[PDB]
Structure formats: C-alpha cells, structure tokens
C-alpha cells in the first residue's frame, strides 16, 4: 500500500550528548527501517551514511569501511527514502543555497526532509566522531578531535535530514548533512560544502518512530539540562 | 506477529494545540487503530476526550459528558494499547502525588513513558474541561472564559494518564497527564488534583513513541518554538 513514509530513530540526540555512547540497535534492525540515513556507531566511533541501501562506517583517521551488518549504533536516523522534488544544477552552489531550494518548496519548518544530493563537490569541509573509551562524557569535551578535515573537487554522495527547530534535543535541529565520496574512501558529517554540479533530491516526512533503548546506561541518564542546544549546535 | 505492539501514539503536537491549531481530521475511528486507552481534546477544543477498554467520552465544559462517536474528530490526542507491568491495590486514602510516587518508584527513570489507570472510588477530584471555541482561533493562554474548575467528591469513576519525559515538553505534555470520568459517565473532565478513597491502579513503561504530523495549513503555519511554551504548557494543564 502507500509506501512507509517514516522517519525511525534510535535514540536520543539528546542522550549520545549525555554520554550514553553505545546502543543495542544493530545495523541490521536500521535496515529494517529504511534504506536511507546517518548516525554514528558504538563508542563514537566514527559516522554512519547509508543510501541505496547501503551503510558505511566513515572513522576518525581519515578513511572509511563498509559497515558489518551486526554493528550497533546509538543514535541512527533512518527512512525509505521516497523523495517529491528534484532539482538539477550547472552553475555551482553552496550548502545554504540548497537549503533555500528545499525551504522554497517546502516552507513549514513543522515537517521533517529527506535529502540526498549525487555530484560533483567544489568544497566539503567534514568532522568526524573519534572511537572513544570510558569514562563516556558528554559530546561537548569530546577530546577534541573535532578538527575540520577538507575535500576537493571530489564526486560522492550527501545525505541528510532537516529537523523541526523545537525538535531539537530529541534530534539534529535544524539540516543535518553526511558525505561519502564515490570512492567510498572518505566523507564525515558536513559542516559546509559547495557543490560544482549535482542532482538534489528530497521529500517531506510527517511521520516519526522514537525507539527508547532499554539498556541502563540510557536509563540513569539526564537528558533535560538546559544546555542541550548549543552543545547540539557544536556537533 | 510475534513481538508486543507498545508503542505511545500521537496526533501532535501539543505546541501545536497550544499555538492555536485547534483542527485536526485524525478521526476517533483513527485513534482506536492505535490504541485501547488515552485522552486529548477534541476540534475546536470541544471538551476533553477520554479512553480505556476502547471507550471514547467527550467531556464538555458545559458538564454533558457524552459518549464519542468514531467519526468525530481531534487536533491533538494520544494513544497507546495497554499493557501494565504493575498492578497495586489501595485499602486506604492516597492522594494524587503518592500514586505518583508508587509508579516514580517502580519507573525511575524518567526517560521512558508511563501508561496509567485506575480504577475505583475517589473521595475529592478537581478538574478543568476545555470549552469549545470559535474564531480567531486563540492560544490556550488566552482563555475567555469558560474554564471554571470543578469539585467532585465521594464518586467512583475511571481514571486515564500519562507519564511524560520532562525534555519532550511542547512534543506532549511533560510529567503526569491524568483525564477521569465518573462511574455515571456522566461527569468527568482532565484532572488538576485528585484524592483516592480506594481502588486498583495498573500501569507499565513504553519505549516507543510515534509522532504522526498533520499536513493542514493550520499545522503548517503554527509556531510551535516559543520562549513561551514550557510555562504556558504548564498554566494550561496546571
Ligand atoms: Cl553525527
Ligand atoms: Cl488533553
Ligand atoms: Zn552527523
Ligand atoms: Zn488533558
């Protein structure tokens, strides 16, 4: 019937800045969710993308790997990506000048996107998570490995989320990009990038699935202090 | 299917309904696919909306509570089929906050959800019942003003709740959520404070939690950041 139109999420976004670093929802049951989406791993240890249906693990030292299908992740992002616009590009734009395109045509800030973008990219500035060891503290003094590492003039493929501004917390407010280059060599989570050329697709999503974990670790955690947002908007 | 069907769901937000969105089309019918038990308002925030066993009242300002009908339909309302973990029984007075301390004891942590019922005799009950509204549609906080609170005292009747994340406020409303009706289902209404004389209370955790997004204009234009919301949530529910 009417393809599943959701946005799964294990969870929180709130909770992987708390400190709760390692889930028991396996690669495998994100599959099971959806053939599109991002997150990181067990230990932040690095980013996952995954697209068509296929999931990488992008790690700190530069690099990437295809992901095993019994990793497990606490926090991933996931959907049956059915996107509802498209939009070409010959002349080169930047990350913002997406957003204005998929802010045109879908202007309530209320509803979920999907975005994937396939092409050529001028510029991509990317972080990325490192593996990390206990005791887990928050994701605000992560080490910090949190340096800019650039790409250039490489083919690949972003995918990503926008997030309703008072979701914030529960996910990334805001749009939320990952990267992987054709090589399936390198990526990380955008910080900023600017497209020489590229195919834009994207969909808007009203429905969302939170899948609370049940392990301890994300039971003793707190996740309302009133700091959350500029510690989110720092990831 | 082979694994348990425990999933709290809602027709959202309740920022939305604060801001003033104040029509949904999720019919009563829609719900019950989603759930034996719950509560919300109804469109135009016609009265409060209550249900267990798969029993849906309209409860009105106006004090006719009245049995809803499948068709009609609600801008905000939360569902969930069931399935208590814990089940306590009270020989004697207990007020609202100590039941509350029996399930935060038992559920300590605040991260997950908690479904609510009970059933028996309750010595006091305040509650508060939205009046139904008409253009412009207002936020809650604007209230004008058919909003008394009412007193029932010595009455048996069925208690609905739940038990919300302190950081999903403006999602749904933070901390415990209590709607009751009396025995008669004649009367009722969404609880400020309660008294129980005696009776049986059951109730469980929920891990998963389904947002369903309306796709009107209404809901599309609404605000649903404000500086204003935890408070206001808060002043509304009490
Ligand atoms: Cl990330
Ligand atoms: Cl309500
Ligand atoms: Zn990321
Ligand atoms: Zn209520």
Not at 26 to 50: K, P, Q, R, S, V
Not at 56 to 76: I, N
Not at 132 to 159: C, I
């Amino acid at each position: 019937q009417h393809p599943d139109s959701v946005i799964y999420q294990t969870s929180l976004m709130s909770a992987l800045l708390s400190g709760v670093y390692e889930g028991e929802t396996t690669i495998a049951d994100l599959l099971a969710h959806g053939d599109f989406g991002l997150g990181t791993f067990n230990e932040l240890d690095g980013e996952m993308i995954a697209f068509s249906s296929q999931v990488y693990q992008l790690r700190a030292d530069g690099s990437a790997r295809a992901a095993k299908p019994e990793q497990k992740t606490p926090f991933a992002v996931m959907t049956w990506f059915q996107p509802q616009y498209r939009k070409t590009f010959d002349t080169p734009v930047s990350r913002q000048q997406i957003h204005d395109v998929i802010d045109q045509q879908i202007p309530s800030d209320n509803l979920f996107c999907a975005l994937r973008i396939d092409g050529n990219f001028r510029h991509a500035h990317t972080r990325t998570v490192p593996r990390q060891t206990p005791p887990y503290r928050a994701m605000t003094d992560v080490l910090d490995d949190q340096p800019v590492f650039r790409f250039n003039q490489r083919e690949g493929v972003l995918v990503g989320f926008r997030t309703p501004q008072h979701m914030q917390g529960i996910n990334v407010a805001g749009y939320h990009e990952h990267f992987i280059t054709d090589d399936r060599q390198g990526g990380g989570h955008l910080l900023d990038y600017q497209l020489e050329s590229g195919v834009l697709t994207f969909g808007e999503i009203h429905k969302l699935m939170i899948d609370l974990p049940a392990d301890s670790a994300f039971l003793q955690a707190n996740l309302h202090p009133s700091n959350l947002d500029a510690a989110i908007r720092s990831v």
